[PDB]
Amino acid sequence: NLWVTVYYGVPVWKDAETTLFCASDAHNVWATHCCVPTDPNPQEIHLENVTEEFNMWKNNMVEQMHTDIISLWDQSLKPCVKLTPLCVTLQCTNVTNNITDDMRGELKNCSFNMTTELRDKKQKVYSLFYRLDVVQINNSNKEYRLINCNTSAITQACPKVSFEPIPIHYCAPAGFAILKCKDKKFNGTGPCTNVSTVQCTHGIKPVVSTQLLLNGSLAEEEVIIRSENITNNAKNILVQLNESVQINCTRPNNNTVKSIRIGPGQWFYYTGDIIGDIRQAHCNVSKATWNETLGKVVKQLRKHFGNNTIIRFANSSGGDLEVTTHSFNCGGEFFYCNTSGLFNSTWISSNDSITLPCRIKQIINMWQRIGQAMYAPPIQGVIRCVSNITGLILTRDGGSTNSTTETFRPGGGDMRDNWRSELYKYKVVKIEPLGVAPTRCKRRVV
Amino acid sequence: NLWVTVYYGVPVWKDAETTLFCASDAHNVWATHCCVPTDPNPQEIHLENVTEEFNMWKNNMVEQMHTDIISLWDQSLKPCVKLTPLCVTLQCTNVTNNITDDMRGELKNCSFNMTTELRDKKQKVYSLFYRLDVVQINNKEYRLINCNTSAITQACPKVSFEPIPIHYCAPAGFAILKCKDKKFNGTGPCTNVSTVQCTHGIKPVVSTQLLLNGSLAEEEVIIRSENITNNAKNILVQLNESVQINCTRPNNNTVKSIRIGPGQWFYYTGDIIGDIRQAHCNVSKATWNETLGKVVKQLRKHFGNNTIIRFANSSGGDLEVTTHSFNCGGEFFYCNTSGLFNSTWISSNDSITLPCRIKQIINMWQRIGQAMYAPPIQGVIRCVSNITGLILTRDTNSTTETFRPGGGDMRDNWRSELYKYKVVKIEPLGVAPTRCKRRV
Amino acid sequence: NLWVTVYYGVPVWKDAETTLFCASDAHNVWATHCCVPTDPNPQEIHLENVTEEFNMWKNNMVEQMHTDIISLWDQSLKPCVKLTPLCVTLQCTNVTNNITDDMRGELKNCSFNMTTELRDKKQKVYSLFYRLDVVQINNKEYRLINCNTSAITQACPKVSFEPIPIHYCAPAGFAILKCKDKKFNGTGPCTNVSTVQCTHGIKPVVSTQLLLNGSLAEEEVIIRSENITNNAKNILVQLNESVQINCTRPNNNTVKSIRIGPGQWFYYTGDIIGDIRQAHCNVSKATWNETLGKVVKQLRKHFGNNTIIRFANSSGGDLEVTTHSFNCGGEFFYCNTSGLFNSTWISNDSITLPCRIKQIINMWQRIGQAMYAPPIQGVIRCVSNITGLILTRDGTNSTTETFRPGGGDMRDNWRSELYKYKVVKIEPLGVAPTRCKRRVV
Amino acid sequence: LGFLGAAGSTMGAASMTLTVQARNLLSCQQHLLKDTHWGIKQLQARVLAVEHYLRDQQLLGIWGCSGKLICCTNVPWNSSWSNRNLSEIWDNMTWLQWDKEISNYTQIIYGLLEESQNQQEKNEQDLL
Amino acid sequence: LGFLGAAGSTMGAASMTLTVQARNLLSECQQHLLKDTHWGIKQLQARVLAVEHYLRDQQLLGIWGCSGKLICCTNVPWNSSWSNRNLSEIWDNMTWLQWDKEISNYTQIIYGLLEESQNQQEKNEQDLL
Amino acid sequence: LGFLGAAGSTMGAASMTLTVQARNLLSCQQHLLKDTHWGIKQLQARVLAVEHYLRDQQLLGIWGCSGKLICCTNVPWNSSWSNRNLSEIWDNMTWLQWDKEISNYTQIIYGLLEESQNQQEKNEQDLLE
Numbered sequence A: 001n002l003w004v005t006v007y008y009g010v011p012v013w014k015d016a017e018t019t020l021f022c023a024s025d026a027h028n029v030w031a032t033h034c035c036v037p038t039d040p041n042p043q044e045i046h047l048e049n050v051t052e053e054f055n056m057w058k059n060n061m062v063e064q065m066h067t068d069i070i071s072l073w074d075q076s077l078k079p080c081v082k083l084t085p086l087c088v089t090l091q092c093t094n095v096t097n098n099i100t101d102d103m104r105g106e107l108k109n110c111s112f113n114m115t116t117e118l119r120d121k122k123q124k125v126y127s128l129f130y131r132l133d134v135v136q137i138n139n140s141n142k143e144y145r146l147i148n149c150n151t152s153a154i155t156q157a158c159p160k161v162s163f164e165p166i167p168i169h170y171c172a173p174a175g176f177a178i179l180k181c182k183d184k185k186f187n188g189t190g191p192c193t194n195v196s197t198v199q200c201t202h203g204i205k206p207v208v209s210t211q212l213l214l215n216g217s218l219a220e221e222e223v224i225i226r227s228e229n230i231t232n233n234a235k236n237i238l239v240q241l242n243e244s245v246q247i248n249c250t251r252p253n254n255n256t257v258k259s260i261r262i263g264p265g266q267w268f269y270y271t272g273d274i275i276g277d278i279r280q281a282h283c284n285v286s287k288a289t290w291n292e293t294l295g296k297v298v299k300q301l302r303k304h305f306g307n308n309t310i311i312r313f314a315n316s317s318g319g320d321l322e323v324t325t326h327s328f329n330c331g332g333e334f335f336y337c338n339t340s341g342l343f344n345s346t347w348i349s350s351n352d353s354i355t356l357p358c359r360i361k362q363i364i365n366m367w368q369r370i371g372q373a374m375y376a377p378p379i380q381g382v383i384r385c386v387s388n389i390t391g392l393i394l395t396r397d398g399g400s401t402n403s404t405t406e407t408f409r410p411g412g413g414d415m416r417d418n419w420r421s422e423l424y425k426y427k428v429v430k431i432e433p434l435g436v437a438p439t440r441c442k443r444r445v446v
Numbered sequence B: 001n002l003w004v005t006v007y008y009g010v011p012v013w014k015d016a017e018t019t020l021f022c023a024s025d026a027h028n029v030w031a032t033h034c035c036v037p038t039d040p041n042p043q044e045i046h047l048e049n050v051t052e053e054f055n056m057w058k059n060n061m062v063e064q065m066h067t068d069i070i071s072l073w074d075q076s077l078k079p080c081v082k083l084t085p086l087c088v089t090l091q092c093t094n095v096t097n098n099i100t101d102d103m104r105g106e107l108k109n110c111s112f113n114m115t116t117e118l119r120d121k122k123q124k125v126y127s128l129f130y131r132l133d134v135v136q137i138n139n140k141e142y143r144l145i146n147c148n149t150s151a152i153t154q155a156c157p158k159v160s161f162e163p164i165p166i167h168y169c170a171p172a173g174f175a176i177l178k179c180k181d182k183k184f185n186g187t188g189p190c191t192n193v194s195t196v197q198c199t200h201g202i203k204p205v206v207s208t209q210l211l212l213n214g215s216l217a218e219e220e221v222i223i224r225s226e227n228i229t230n231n232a233k234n235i236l237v238q239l240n241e242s243v244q245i246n247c248t249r250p251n252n253n254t255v256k257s258i259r260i261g262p263g264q265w266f267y268y269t270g271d272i273i274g275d276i277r278q279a280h281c282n283v284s285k286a287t288w289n290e291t292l293g294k295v296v297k298q299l300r301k302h303f304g305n306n307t308i309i310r311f312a313n314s315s316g317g318d319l320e321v322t323t324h325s326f327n328c329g330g331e332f333f334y335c336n337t338s339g340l341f342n343s344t345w346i347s348s349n350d351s352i353t354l355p356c357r358i359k360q361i362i363n364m365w366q367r368i369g370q371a372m373y374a375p376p377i378q379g380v381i382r383c384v385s386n387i388t389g390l391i392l393t394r395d396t397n398s399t400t401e402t403f404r405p406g407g408g409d410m411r412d413n414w415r416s417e418l419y420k421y422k423v424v425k426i427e428p429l430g431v432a433p434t435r436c437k438r439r440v
Numbered sequence C: 001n002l003w004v005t006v007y008y009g010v011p012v013w014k015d016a017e018t019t020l021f022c023a024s025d026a027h028n029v030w031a032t033h034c035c036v037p038t039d040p041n042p043q044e045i046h047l048e049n050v051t052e053e054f055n056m057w058k059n060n061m062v063e064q065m066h067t068d069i070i071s072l073w074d075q076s077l078k079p080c081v082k083l084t085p086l087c088v089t090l091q092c093t094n095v096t097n098n099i100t101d102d103m104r105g106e107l108k109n110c111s112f113n114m115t116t117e118l119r120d121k122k123q124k125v126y127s128l129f130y131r132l133d134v135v136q137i138n139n140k141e142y143r144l145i146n147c148n149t150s151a152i153t154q155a156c157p158k159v160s161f162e163p164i165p166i167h168y169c170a171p172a173g174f175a176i177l178k179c180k181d182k183k184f185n186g187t188g189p190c191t192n193v194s195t196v197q198c199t200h201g202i203k204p205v206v207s208t209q210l211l212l213n214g215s216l217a218e219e220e221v222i223i224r225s226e227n228i229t230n231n232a233k234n235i236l237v238q239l240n241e242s243v244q245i246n247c248t249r250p251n252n253n254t255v256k257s258i259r260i261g262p263g264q265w266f267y268y269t270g271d272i273i274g275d276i277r278q279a280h281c282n283v284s285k286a287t288w289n290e291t292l293g294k295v296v297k298q299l300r301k302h303f304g305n306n307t308i309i310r311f312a313n314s315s316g317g318d319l320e321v322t323t324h325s326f327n328c329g330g331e332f333f334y335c336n337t338s339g340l341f342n343s344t345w346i347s348n349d350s351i352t353l354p355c356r357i358k359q360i361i362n363m364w365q366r367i368g369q370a371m372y373a374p375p376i377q378g379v380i381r382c383v384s385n386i387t388g389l390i391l392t393r394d395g396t397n398s399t400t401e402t403f404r405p406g407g408g409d410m411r412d413n414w415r416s417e418l419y420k421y422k423v424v425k426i427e428p429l430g431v432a433p434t435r436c437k438r439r440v441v
Numbered sequence D: 001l002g003f004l005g006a007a008g009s010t011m012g013a014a015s016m017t018l019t020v021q022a023r024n025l026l027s028c029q030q031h032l033l034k035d036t037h038w039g040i041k042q043l044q045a046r047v048l049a050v051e052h053y054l055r056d057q058q059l060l061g062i063w064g065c066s067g068k069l070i071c072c073t074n075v076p077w078n079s080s081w082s083n084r085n086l087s088e089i090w091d092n093m094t095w096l097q098w099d100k101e102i103s104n105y106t107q108i109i110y111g112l113l114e115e116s117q118n119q120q121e122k123n124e125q126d127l128l
Numbered sequence E: 001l002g003f004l005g006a007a008g009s010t011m012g013a014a015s016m017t018l019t020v021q022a023r024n025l026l027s028e029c030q031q032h033l034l035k036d037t038h039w040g041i042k043q044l045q046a047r048v049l050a051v052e053h054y055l056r057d058q059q060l061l062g063i064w065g066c067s068g069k070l071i072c073c074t075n076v077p078w079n080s081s082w083s084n085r086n087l088s089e090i091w092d093n094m095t096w097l098q099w100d101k102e103i104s105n106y107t108q109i110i111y112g113l114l115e116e117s118q119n120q121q122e123k124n125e126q127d128l129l
Numbered sequence F: 001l002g003f004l005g006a007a008g009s010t011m012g013a014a015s016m017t018l019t020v021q022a023r024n025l026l027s028c029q030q031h032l033l034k035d036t037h038w039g040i041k042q043l044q045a046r047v048l049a050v051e052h053y054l055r056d057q058q059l060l061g062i063w064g065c066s067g068k069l070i071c072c073t074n075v076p077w078n079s080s081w082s083n084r085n086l087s088e089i090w091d092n093m094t095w096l097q098w099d100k101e102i103s104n105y106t107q108i109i110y111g112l113l114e115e116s117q118n119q120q121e122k123n124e125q126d127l128l129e
């Protein structure tokens, strides 16, 4: 004795994939792009008697971060000076004045022919290189070419443009909603009961780095390790710390940047002169802090691998610097730090900071993509920055020896895996307001 | 007595034009762009007791097909390397190595300066050229034929341009109607019609003089044109059976490549292994003769019982209209047709060999402000195509008329596959007199 | 006692901004990009007992016009041949051939090399051109004036830039209101108003110093400024009579061209046929003096019956700032207006204004791009209608004030033509009290 | 049975298929977005379909027919538009045939429907 | 009188023109839509916004239980906290522009009241069935 | 409660929250225009939201519910869809749980709703004539 009753405005949803847009709270690329203002009201609604399943490894928002970040990057670089006319035979010599023994021939003094405003005139330019950007022509030790002359055209970045990451808030389009998990112990891939609605995410700062994750959210309560298919050594491990570690980085030398005209309406920037004893770049971390932090990580993985294990750390496998070193941007310059000193220990059940030497590059490929190149003009003076280590990417060697000793190394990964961390908290669903139910009424018919 | 009653959802329509969306059945250019999948649904509704009028010569879909094709073609070339750095003087001499009399001076061995990965370096290379794309400057000084008129872009070697069937689908609010009358000539009323969701899969085949790989008539031979009497119209002939044509370029080419810049590779024709002979195409003489005899009987139905049909080659014009053209294996062929149109029809077997020329610098789509270079293909090329129709023109009660093959808009080829389809817009509102009055 | 009654279809609006679509009637760039036809049916609704607040200096229709015109200009140059490869060292000497009007040093005979169709070939070529387009490097070396600053693009010779009337039309949901008060001063509660779907056509004429080919005022000359006592604001003078100005580029010319690449044509000046003569514009002095008379009367109405109005020339600055400027025959003219502002007022005679021609044009007061004006063959003549002025009071209490042809940005030409018009958004929903309660079953 | 299946049916016979016709009116993007023209061209087409849909709905509202597939009015039928018998109109003729025959008069009819509804709503408000 | 034929009409006088105003919203060359990317986009955006505007108002009338009617009498009383304007002037001295300006401060309040009253009545009808 | 505040509520408990859910379905500049891909993506998103909205409204019209949030029809409830107590459903099941309970019947119910309404309108037409 029941009929169909129809309702519109039913508070339900289904998992869905849509396009999100960004906003911020105000030269910067991020600011230019995410020009849409934010709403100061958190608009977060706790739901009672709610459960939801959050699988961060299937979170499409991670892909969106990647897609749109790259897109912005490309748009920002596009309207700038092409350095194509300069990928020419270069004459070089090694620098022998005010050089420490750590540097030796890493820094080179080169000279070459350059164009001028009139096509009929040519000038001669002198500049400095860090070796990593320059290779031998074919082997003569006077003649060199830029590393990219056989692969891609290089565009210099416009010096007025700021890439400093800012927190960015992502907001749902009408018809969609964002759900958030606040379960402090949630490890991803699964149900969460501390569920609330979200209109816009918190501000996520798009920091790009490799082996160590800087300036992200810090874990609440305890160090937590998140991974999928954990016994499979093909997967990496994302570790989120609940205490930050301070790292002090520097580019110690005084760089006098010079610029010249290259063609109508266009300037070229280069290194000019360097003042003071020349040293490589460095990053400092307290050794005690690092050891305490690491021990905490070890305890968490120990519960995952067994009470009787030995946790051994080792440095990374060989390969490109973007894989083997801690690659990050500091002060606008690109650093490649040797992290092997952070992994030389085995764990068995004043600060004396560990200092990592770091290389600097002027020719930058980007996003693990090739066929494009960017030239990073030098920055005048001396550079320092201080960053917060909030998490790590690690891999396990795997294999079966059953020795109880597991080996962990700096992990490699995608930029997507950095963003994956912040986004573990959010899911996108579509609102479905229409539905039916049984009833004792029947439409009145007259 | 009667009042106006409004009816919504009335199954009626009007003639309309709208953009269609391109879909494929599923890294070919056609497929990459026309990536929208088709439905596994041969959806058709027979419009019982409905008559509709079709006019293929006014069909908007042909124009859209053309426009979208041009656009896609250019989009494909937009990211490819320019060959403008190669607009230099060539130092050319005749090739005499294993070359027969039907070739002689067609091939040239040219040397020239070109750029390198580094701006300051230059290199000297040797390359083999076809006479059709190289012009004497005045001696030994030659240039690429188009470096005076337009930029030349190299087509990307990785891209496949072979046609795939494409289905055109209506946007909501629109429908495609189809004529199922097997005897329909493209312009009259059609009394056997049905609705269509998407057209059949039509391959974007490009050719001149003879139509290739299209649909065949059930009803023997149909000859149609916008107006037969009008001597300015180009007549399309649809056949019920195909004629197979076997085309080849017998020479084994050795392909090499050199960089002219950081990501810029130029592909050169290199040299030839073995004997050098002309490219050519073969058809059966009888098959061709049987086909024409039927065409003639059909022509008499429009031109007279005592009419004598004289076949001849085209009257003149550039290579693009005087030769048959196609792109077999990706190489561009310009084949002679005089061997096909010599006879006069009155009231294990031998084949016809058509000599062919090869060209690499192509002015595509009947345009002149663009040119492209077709990278050479390594090895020897062979294919067989289906001739499914003819493109014909004709020249004081002589009783004898002359018909010739010829060129025309590429649109005219596409008109054939689209001849049976029409686009209409759906119009859901209408009113009618009834005996009810709105309750007041 | 009263309930709520809800109404939809309520004839009300609020001020709002939107984008208005560009249309025209009847190779011309304005027509090409405003292909949308106008409605041949005129339309207007008077609104009796409606008074509206207008402010011509807060009118966003002006800003839209500005943005769209610049975009149009750039879009039209995008597909044209670049002249970048021609930034070569020039060897130049002075031309005295058939020198007349003592215009010495104005033109130079420059020889230079250029790259032709093949990369292997260079050619020595010659051209004749104005000093305003060239600088010395320091039979001396010279370069084009804009080769250090930016790329130079040749405008396409087939494109006409002649202004045509452009009509702006509201999108559905919007309406344009207009002020019909002949004496409206640019701001305030205009009482004679009506609703208009599309504006009248406005010709997008761009000029400096004086306003050419605009609308004339009714009644009398109307002078308008945002702030009257702030000398930083210029005052627009809309005349109720048009002054004829006859402009010419008196020389006859041979135009030459050369290929500089694959289908890439460059056009240049060739040579001069006959005597070399100064460019100029003619105005009847008497009508000019009558016009000034009307203007000084209107100025005194704001400053006092006994004040003295001193006219004077423009301040020092760039030609685009200090001289009169217009496009006639495709050539760019820079004219000396000091002869128009010499008198002091208190209670044939054709003046000839000398002019100069420049081929490399920066435009819209923007820096970093330049457009090369193709040479025009033959002799150029046009007559324009002077419909207004842009003046500054120049800031003693001596009662004598100086009025200079300060000029202004391009928006002022548009502020003047689009002053009549305002944009609002339609808002059909509203409420009022009634006597009934909704009938309840 | 299907969209336009009733097109050859008589006007009366086709009345029960009005619902199929209504349902069908509103019925590799990572690649396609990159093609500016493909993207814009197809988006515009979708927008236009929406605009047409809404205009018809707007009219049904105006005429007081928004809640019905079949809506009776107070506007009389004019012999000027058609003087044909109802039995032929409904039982012999199809909608395609019939509609073509009155294509002149449609605007007249619409204006009448709009005014009739206008007066009826006023009457209701004055009564309440 | 035409679209917005008058706006000097009293509110009462203007009631028979509601059907006119109601018809304004949604009321080779074409190659230019793609040739000029920004031009085509700006126009498309404007059309979209007009539609969005239309739909929001229609949804709201539906919510309040007025729907397709141009004039509705509701179950929400006119409040005493609102300016105490005389009913004779409200309908025949005042025009809609003047009136709306006088009562614009309260718009969001009256809308909330209208929404709630309708929601309650609908629930009551379900209980009655 | 707010938007989706009622999501964890039971079916009857969520009565009268229908209105918030309905209200929330509908809702620098030089960058938004210059970045063509950006602008297209955002415009498409708004267009899609509209298309979605319209499909739901169309169905409510087709089924004879139209502008109502709460409707009751002439179509019977089937044992092939569910066999649960009416109070179990209305007092204890969450609307989200309910959708999980009724799965792949949507198209059946809709077909029934569509046909029933079609016949009902025909019956009214015959009675008036």
Ligand SMILES: *[C@@H]1O[C@H](CO)[C@@H](O[C@@H]2O[C@H](CO)[C@@H](O[C@@H]3O[C@H](CO[C@H]4O[C@H](CO)[C@@H](O)[C@H](O)[C@@H]4O)[C@@H](O)[C@H](O[C@H]4O[C@H](CO)[C@@H](O)[C@H](O)[C@@H]4O)[C@@H]3O)[C@H](O)[C@H]2NC(C)=O)[C@H](O)[C@H]1NC(C)=O
Residues within 6 Å of the ligand: A164, A165, A207, A214, A215, A328, A329, A330, A331, A332, A385, A386, A387, A388
């Ligand atoms: C993790 O988070 C920390 C803290 O936010 C980041 O540290 C900052 O990093 C940025 C980028 O390297 C630094 O930016 C620089 O700021 C300079 C000005 O600051 C000094 O002077 C002001 C007074 O004017 C003082 O208030 C301030 O304390 C400093 O003493 C700029 O001069 C720098 O130059 C650039 O911008 C200017 C315009 O402002 C241009 O004219 C220049 O040409 C050039 O482009 C630059 O902007 C910032 O100072 C750091 N803050 C601190 C406290 O150290 C870490 O970088 C971040 N880690 C990661 C991985 O992202």
Ligand SMILES: *[C@@H]1O[C@H](CO)[C@@H](O[C@@H]2O[C@H](CO)[C@@H](O)[C@H](O)[C@H]2NC(C)=O)[C@H](O)[C@H]1NC(C)=O
Residues within 6 Å of the ligand: A093, A094, A104, A105, A106, A131, A141
């Ligand atoms: C400049 O420095 C580089 C190192 O940066 C020198 O390269 C080394 O040359 C020796 C002798 O051939 C090799 O055995 C080393 O393996 C090279 N080092 C590297 C890293 O490859 C280079 O010879 C120096 N040049 C001059 C003129 O001093």
Ligand SMILES: *[C@@H]1O[C@H](CO)[C@@H](O[C@@H]2O[C@H](CO)[C@@H](O)[C@H](O)[C@H]2NC(C)=O)[C@H](O)[C@H]1NC(C)=O
Residues within 6 Å of the ligand: B091, B111, B112, B113, B124, B125
């Ligand atoms: C490439 O360019 C060079 C010149 O830069 C050519 O070499 C000269 O050719 C002339 C004859 O035309 C000789 O008289 C010179 O002695 C040659 N110079 C040198 C250094 O060899 C060369 O022939 C060109 N090569 C090609 C393949 O075009």
Ligand SMILES: *[C@@H]1O[C@H](CO)[C@@H](O[C@@H]2O[C@H](CO)[C@@H](O)[C@H](O)[C@H]2NC(C)=O)[C@H](O)[C@H]1NC(C)=O
Residues within 6 Å of the ligand: B252, B253, B273, B378, B379, B380
């Ligand atoms: C063209 O000639 C080359 C040269 O012989 C052929 O390359 C040979 O290919 C076969 C396999 O098909 C190999 O076994 C030979 O070793 C290759 N030759 C060489 C140089 O090693 C090529 O196949 C020929 N192509 C055609 C289509 O005739």
Ligand SMILES: *[C@@H]1O[C@H](CO)[C@@H](O[C@@H]2O[C@H](CO)[C@@H](O)[C@H](O)[C@H]2NC(C)=O)[C@H](O)[C@H]1NC(C)=O
Residues within 6 Å of the ligand: C089, C091, C111, C112, C113, C124
């Ligand atoms: C065009 O280029 C030629 C060279 O290819 C220039 O002529 C030479 O100029 C130098 C100047 O130092 C003289 O020493 C040579 O004797 C000249 N050679 C010849 C053949 O004349 C020529 O001046 C350039 N043209 C222009 C206008 O600058």
Ligand SMILES: *[C@@H]1O[C@H](CO)[C@@H](O)[C@H](O)[C@H]1NC(C)=O
Residues within 6 Å of the ligand: A221, A222, A223, A242, A243, A296, A297, A299
């Ligand atoms: C951080 O996590 C570690 C995990 O070993 C825990 O022992 C420590 O107390 C936590 N820190 C804080 C401040 O809660």
Ligand SMILES: *[C@@H]1O[C@H](CO)[C@@H](O)[C@H](O)[C@H]1NC(C)=O
Residues within 6 Å of the ligand: B094, B104, B105, B106
């Ligand atoms: C090269 O071929 C052309 C065309 O057949 C011929 O006229 C010319 O004489 C030939 N030259 C030589 C050197 O064989």
Ligand SMILES: *[C@@H]1O[C@H](CO)[C@@H](O)[C@H](O)[C@H]1NC(C)=O
Residues within 6 Å of the ligand: B227, B228, B229, B230, B231, B232
């Ligand atoms: C075709 O064109 C000719 C003129 O060329 C004309 O005489 C003839 O009547 C036309 N036929 C039709 C069917 O229009």
Ligand SMILES: *[C@@H]1O[C@H](CO)[C@@H](O)[C@H](O)[C@H]1NC(C)=O
Residues within 6 Å of the ligand: B313, B314, B315, B316, B317, B322, B338
């Ligand atoms: C046609 O054939 C004749 C030989 O009979 C030949 O001379 C003429 O060049 C050919 N022309 C065309 C266009 O095929």
Ligand SMILES: *[C@@H]1O[C@H](CO)[C@@H](O)[C@H](O)[C@H]1NC(C)=O
Residues within 6 Å of the ligand: C093, C094, C104, C105, C139
């Ligand atoms: C050109 O005229 C200037 C004066 O304007 C003079 O200084 C210069 O010497 C003259 N040059 C020649 C070649 O006569």
Ligand SMILES: *[C@@H]1O[C@H](CO)[C@@H](O)[C@H](O)[C@H]1NC(C)=O
Residues within 6 Å of the ligand: C226, C227, C228, C229, C230
């Ligand atoms: C001009 O501006 C000044 C402030 O700078 C102001 O005091 C004065 O009233 C303004 N005059 C007019 C006419 O607006």
Ligand SMILES: *[C@@H]1O[C@H](CO)[C@@H](O)[C@H](O)[C@H]1NC(C)=O
Residues within 6 Å of the ligand: B048, B049, D006, D007, D008, D009, D010
């Ligand atoms: C077509 O006509 C036949 C009678 O000859 C009739 O039975 C059939 O139903 C008609 N078809 C349609 C679609 O009305």
Ligand SMILES: *[C@@H]1O[C@H](CO)[C@@H](O)[C@H](O)[C@H]1NC(C)=O
Residues within 6 Å of the ligand: D076, D077, D078, D079, D080, D081
């Ligand atoms: C019918 O239409 C004519 C105009 O064609 C008009 O004069 C006549 O009054 C109308 N009659 C009715 C009943 O509407």
Ligand SMILES: *[C@@H]1O[C@H](CO)[C@@H](O)[C@H](O)[C@H]1NC(C)=O
Residues within 6 Å of the ligand: D100, D101, D102, D103, D104
């Ligand atoms: C009225 O419509 C008929 C077709 O039904 C048409 O033949 C006739 O010419 C039309 N009359 C006018 C005045 O348009």
Ligand SMILES: *[C@@H]1O[C@H](CO)[C@@H](O)[C@H](O)[C@H]1NC(C)=O
Residues within 6 Å of the ligand: C047, C048, C049, E006, E007, E008, E009, E010
């Ligand atoms: C303006 O007010 C007068 C006096 O009340 C009235 O007669 C006239 O109709 C009003 N104008 C309009 C457009 O309502």
Ligand SMILES: *[C@@H]1O[C@H](CO)[C@@H](O)[C@H](O)[C@H]1NC(C)=O
Residues within 6 Å of the ligand: F100, F101, F102, F103, F104
């Ligand atoms: C339909 O839903 C039921 C649960 O309600 C499930 O058991 C059944 O397998 C589903 N049918 C399909 C689509 O497989």
